[PDB]
XYZ file of C-alpha atoms in Angstrom:
30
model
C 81.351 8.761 8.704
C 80.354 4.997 9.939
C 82.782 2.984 12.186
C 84.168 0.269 11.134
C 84.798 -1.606 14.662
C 88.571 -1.206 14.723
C 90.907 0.941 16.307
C 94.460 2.082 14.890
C 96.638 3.795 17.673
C 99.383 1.491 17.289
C 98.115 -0.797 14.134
C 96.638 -0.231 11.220
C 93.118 -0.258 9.934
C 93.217 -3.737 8.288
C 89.557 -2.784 8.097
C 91.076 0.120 5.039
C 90.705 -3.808 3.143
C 86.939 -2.543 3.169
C 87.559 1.010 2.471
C 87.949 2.095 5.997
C 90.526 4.933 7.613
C 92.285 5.833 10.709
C 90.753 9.339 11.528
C 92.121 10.351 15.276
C 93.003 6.970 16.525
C 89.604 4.976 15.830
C 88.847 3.341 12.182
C 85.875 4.872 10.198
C 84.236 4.722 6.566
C 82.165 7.473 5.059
């Protein structure tokens, strides 16, 4: 439910390293 200070419309999340996921363009944990 937190952000993890990444975005992913065209990369990854290389912040899914800490458990983080692209949910609707924008990276996010929990």
């Amino acid at each position: 439910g937190f952000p993890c200070g990444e975005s992913c419309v065209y990369g990854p999340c290389f912040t899914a390293a800490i458990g983080c996921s692209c949910k609707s363009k924008v990276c996010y944990k929990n």
